[PDB]
Swiss-Prot record, chain A:
Function (record text): Binds as a heterodimer with protein bS6 to the central domain of the 16S rRNA, where it helps stabilize the platform of the 30S subunit.
Family recorded in the similarity comment: Belongs to the bacterial ribosomal protein bS18 family.
Subunit details: Part of the 30S ribosomal subunit. Forms a tight heterodimer with protein bS6.
Protein's UniProt keywords contain Ribonucleoprotein: yes
Source organism phylogeny: Bacteria, Pseudomonadati, Pseudomonadota, Gammaproteobacteria, Enterobacterales
Protein name: Small ribosomal subunit protein bS18
Coiled coil location: none
Keywords carried by this UniProt record: Acetylation, Ribonucleoprotein, Ribosomal protein, RNA-binding, rRNA-binding
Entry's Gene Ontology BP terms: cytoplasmic translation; translation
Listed GO CC annotations: cytoplasm; cytosol; cytosolic small ribosomal subunit
Record carries keyword Methyltransferase: no
One term of GO molecular function: mRNA 5'-UTR binding
From Swiss-Prot, chain C:
Highest classification ranks of the organism: Bacteria, Pseudomonadati, Pseudomonadota, Gammaproteobacteria, Enterobacterales
Molecular function GO labels: RNA binding; rRNA binding; structural constituent of ribosome; transferase activity; zinc ion binding
Family matches, as PROSITE patterns: RIBOSOMAL_L2
Entry's family note: Belongs to the universal ribosomal protein uL2 family.
Residue numbers carrying N6-acetyllysine: K241
Protein's name according to its UniProt entry: Large ribosomal subunit protein uL2
InterPro entries noted in UniProt: NA-bd_OB-fold, Rib_uL2_dom2, Ribosomal_uL2, Ribosomal_uL2_bac/org-type, Ribosomal_uL2_C, Ribosomal_uL2_CS, Ribosomal_uL2_dom3, Ribosomal_uL2_RNA-bd_dom
Region annotation (Disordered) ranges: 27-52, 220-271
Extra remark: This protein can be partially replaced in vivo by its H.marismortui (HmaL2) or human (L8, from the 60S cytoplasmic ribosome) homolog.
Highest rank taxon of the organism: Bacteria
Swiss-Prot record, chain D:
Coiled-coil residues: none
Protein family membership: Belongs to the bacterial ribosomal protein bS6 family.
Maturation and modification: 5 different forms of the protein, varying only in the number of C-terminal glutamate residues, were isolated. The sequence shown is form bS6-6, which is the longest. The first two Glu are encoded by the rpsF gene, the other Glu are added post-translationally by the RimK enzyme.
Keyword Ribosomal protein attached: yes
The keyword Heme belongs to this UniProt entry's keyword annotation: no
Gene Ontology biological-process annotations: cytoplasmic translation
Function: Binds together with bS18 to 16S ribosomal RNA.
Keywords for this protein: Acetylation, Ribonucleoprotein, Ribosomal protein, RNA-binding, rRNA-binding
PTM-bearing positions, type N6-acetyllysine: K93
Record note on quaternary structure: Part of the 30S ribosomal subunit. Interacts weakly with uL2 in one of the 3.5 A resolved structures.
Name of the featured protein: Small ribosomal subunit protein bS6
Any one annotated GO CC term: cytosolic small ribosomal subunit
Curated annotation (Swiss-Prot), chain E:
Top-rank taxon: Bacteria
Pfam families the UniProt entry points to: Ribosomal_S15
UniProt similarity note: Belongs to the universal ribosomal protein uS15 family.
Lineage summary: Bacteria, Pseudomonadati, Pseudomonadota, Gammaproteobacteria, Enterobacterales
CDD domains referenced in this protein's UniProt entry, alphabetically: Ribosomal_S15p_S13e
Name listed for the protein in its UniProt record: Small ribosomal subunit protein uS15
InterPro entries to which the protein is assigned, alphabetical: Ribosomal_uS15, Ribosomal_uS15_bac-type, uS15_NS1_RNA-bd_sf
One GO MF term: structural constituent of ribosome
Keywords, alphabetical: Ribonucleoprotein, Ribosomal protein, RNA-binding, rRNA-binding, Translation regulation
Organism: Escherichia coli (strain K12)
Induction description: Part of the metY operon that extends to pnp, also has its own promoter.
Assembly behavior: Part of the 30S ribosomal subunit. Forms a bridge to the 50S subunit in the 70S ribosome, contacting the 23S rRNA.
A GO CC term assigned to this protein in UniProt: cytoplasm
Length: 55, 56, 271, 106, 88
RNA sequence: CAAGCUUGAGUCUCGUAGAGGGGGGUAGAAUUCCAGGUGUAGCGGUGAAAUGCGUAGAGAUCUGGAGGAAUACCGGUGGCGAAGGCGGCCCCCUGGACGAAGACUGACGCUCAGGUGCGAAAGCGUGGGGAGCAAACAGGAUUAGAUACCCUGGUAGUCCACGCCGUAAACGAUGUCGACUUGGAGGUUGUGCCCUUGAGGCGUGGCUUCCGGAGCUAACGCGUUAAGUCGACCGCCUGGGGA
RNA sequence: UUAUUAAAAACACAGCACUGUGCAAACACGAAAGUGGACGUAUACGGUGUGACGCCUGCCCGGUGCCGGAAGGUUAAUUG
């Protein structure tokens, strides 16, 4: 149920520089971590999330 | 690792905060990792050795 | 298809020919033919002005529509035809009002495809539009350099041009030579690229195969006497001089373009 | 007839051409025996990074059930339309008629 | 693979019942349908070796089923190979 | 030989996970190059240097553009694949595996000389492409010498399409298939049960990592994923060189 | 191919490479107009060398040439 349009939820799993946080830090399952990575990449494409802190 | 020196903070604490942020971002480790080419077999062997020594 | 002939003869050993089963096996469209008399490379003074031209098979000229100024009216491709006057193949198209014309056959075109010219034509191979209505980055051919003059660039087999930039009333094109040129946006171009791309893979195989194309032998300058060529004679094989044309102009390096009239359109020379 | 999720951004200067674009797209989708599960006009949104030296793009979301021919025509339309600065078509497992978080925020 | 409707149609026309999905005739017919369908995919994707391995698995399985059927009852074998257009 | 049977082997229904494969598109970061603005004497490199670039304005910084290649974070003794291998995102075509409850066929099976197919990298042929890296090559160093390590460049190549090559420490140095034999801690992926208390507990499959018991082994070690106890078939070995 | 003492290992050749050429093309014949190139458009055309195919094609940019560079030095008519 992870949606790339849920930026409020996706921002909890990215650092201050926009990088995805590892599953060891947030303690999320591997399956939902993969879903989160896919959703974050899609949201980066739609310019809803930044690729980096620069641009 | 953007650090905005907020009001009522000395320069030294801002510099130490900048260093802490740049080390938690891991930029120096990455730019030292990327300066020479590491063969896929070399990086696989290194990852395997690190995963093995992470058992104590 | 590209096929290699079996070496049943020394002249057939290296022949590599291009066969196209979709080409029309029959006579061309008569109302679009003209007499095309050979010249032997002679001008109106009767002098040889271009060497190594002469003979070859008799050829009839096909009137190819390079302007493509019949806008709005759709047309369908009847058949692809061989054209002896150019390296590309030509397509006989039939407009809705009953007119038949010859166009350069782009890559991928086949009998039954529908093409159209004009500002409202769809963006697909075979359609002709003013270059200001064509998206930047697309690959086109049969490009005009003056509006309404007729296509002059990218007409050979397999060639094409890509629009790299558009600004104001001009667009920038990357020609097949690698040269960046400016052309005003009102010039027309046809989408896609010219067909028969494997034309360059053919191998003539024997000396006579070039004679069929009207190419006479080339005598090396160093094989002549000093009175005939700057590369002169000598006892044995001697060169000892810088290579030049038969008229003494240095070849192998010396640039000969001298045209200040069109320099403003050359963004960057080939390299 | 598969389900798709279409998101496309329009140039901020072309915000009033968006209703006409949506009208044409729904016409093309329902003309081919297709359905439209969800349609959301998010309006202008600040871009996380500049796209074509631009900030504040206009977002639209569509959830349609349509064959592949009309979806290919829609992708071609997006590619050739100069106002659509960015688009993305994605398949979904089933129909989605729930309001997206972008409009669920209100 | 094959859709559910095509599979049901094959099972119905080649089976002794609508539930006889395990008969040798039904299996050979399904394998032949999948091979014929894959034929068009591999005409366009000549460099897809990983899927061609599964195609050859299907071919060999159909061959073994046809051998078993011919050894078991040759009459049904002939009816099947004429109804499906086999024998090279 | 004839007729059976369902437990081996397959088919169907519904779902699940996956860098499995082929095709097309696109995104951002970065390197290089081109043009311009600011700006001035250095930059680069090294153990130290020099070759090299730089007052013809380099390096730094800012703006715009071009092109190719690879996809940071996720990312993990994680996943998929017969193996080789597979890593941005999206779409189209497509193979395999697994699980739940049933229905179906009824030994249709295992192995396989010869045969065929796939087969990293390098290499070859044709046509493109070529930013970075970099055999050969050139120069500067080091050295007794230095046809090397180090430095500055740099061609093939690496990239794409189609063919060829058919080899690797192609490794788990462990052929495939099946049965049986104490355990512990994990990972990953289904599924079932219960005021579901909870991101819960208890079962039940698939794959997978580490330790270890009997046993086996020359020892090291393997140890239910055996190198233990067996069965079927195949490949291979017979002292070191020559080879 | 040396008509009439030389037919050859000479010339040509398919193939290869370099180089020029963006079209009013380069180039050639023309005091010029013009014409050829070509009713062709870089998979095209001209020039040069090599000479099917196979395996290949190493080092030298000091000299000469060509290409690029534009700072500086020198330098014509002109100006006075």
């Amino acid at each position: 149920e992870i949606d790339y349009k849920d930026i409020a939820t996706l921002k909890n799993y990215i650092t201050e520089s926009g990088k995805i946080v590892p599953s060891r830090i947030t303690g999320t399952r591997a399956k939902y971590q993969r879903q989160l990575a896919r959703a974050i990449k899609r949201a980066r494409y739609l310019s809803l999330l930044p690729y980096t802190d620069r641009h | 690792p953007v650090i905005k020196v907020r009001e009522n903070e000395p320069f030294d604490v801002a510099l130490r905060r900048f260093k802490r942020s740049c080390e938690k971002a891991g930029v120096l480790a990455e730019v030292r990792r990327r300066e020479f080419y590491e063969k896929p077999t070399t990086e696989r062997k290194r990852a395997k050795a690190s995963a093995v020594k992470r058992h104590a | 298809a590209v096929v290699k002939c079996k070496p049943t003869s020394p002249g057939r050993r290296h022949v590599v020919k291009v066969v196209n089963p979709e080409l029309h096996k029959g006579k061309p469209f008569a109302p679009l033919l003209e007499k095309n008399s050979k010249s032997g490379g002679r001008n109106n003074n009767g002098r040889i002005t271009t060497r190594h031209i002469g003979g070859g098979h008799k050829q009839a000229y096909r009137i190819v529509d390079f302007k493509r100024n019949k806008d709005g009216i759709p047309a369908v491709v009847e058949r692809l035809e061989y054209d002896p006057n150019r390296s590309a193949n030509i397509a006989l198209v039939l407009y809705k009002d009953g007119e038949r014309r010859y166009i350069l056959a782009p890559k991928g075109l086949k009998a039954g495809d529908q093409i159209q010219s004009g500002v409202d034509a769809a963006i697909k191979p075979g359609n002709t539009l003013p270059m200001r209505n064509i998206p930047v980055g697309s690959t086109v051919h049969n490009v005009e350099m003056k509006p309404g003059k007729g296509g002059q660039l990218a007409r050979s087999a397999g060639t094409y041009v890509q629009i790299v930039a558009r600004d104001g009333a001009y667009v920038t094109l990357r020609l097949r030579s690698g040269e960046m040129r400016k052309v005003e946006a009102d010039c027309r171009a046809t989408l896609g690229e010219v067909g028969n791309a494997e034309h360059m893979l053919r191998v003539l195989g024997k000396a006579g195969a070039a004679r069929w194309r009207g190419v006479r032998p080339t005598v090396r300058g160093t094989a002549m006497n000093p009175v005939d060529h700057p590369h002169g004679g000598g006892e044995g094989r001697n060169f000892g001089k810088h290579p030049v044309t038969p008229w003494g102009v240095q070849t192998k390096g010396k640039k000969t373009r001298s045209n200040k009239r069109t320099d403003k359109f050359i963004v960057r020379r080939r390299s | 007839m598969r389900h798709y999720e279409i998101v496309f951004m329009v140039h901020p200067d072309q915000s009033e051409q968006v209703p006409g674009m949506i009208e044409r797209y729904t016409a093309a989708i329902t003309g081919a025996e297709g359905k439209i599960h969800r349609l959301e006009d998010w309006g202008r949104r600040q871009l996380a990074y500049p796209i074509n030296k631009l900030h504040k793009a206009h977002y639209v979301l569509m959830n349609v059930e349509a064959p592949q021919e009309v979806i290919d025509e829609l992708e071609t339309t997006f590619r050739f339309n100069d106002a659509v600065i960015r688009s993305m078509v994605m398949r979904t497992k089933h129909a989605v008629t729930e309001a997206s978080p972008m409009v669920k925020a209100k | 693979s094959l859709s559910t409707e095509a599979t049901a149609k094959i099972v119905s026309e080649f089976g002794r019942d609508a539930n006889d999905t395990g008969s040798t005739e039904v299996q050979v017919a399904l394998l032949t349908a999948q091979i014929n369908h894959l034929q068009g995919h591999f005409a366009e994707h000549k460099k897809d070796h990983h899927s061609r391995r599964g195609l050859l698995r299907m071919v060999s399985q159909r061959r073994k089923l046809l051998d078993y059927l011919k050894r078991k009852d040759v009459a049904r074998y002939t009816q099947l190979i004429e109804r499906l257009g086999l024998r090279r």
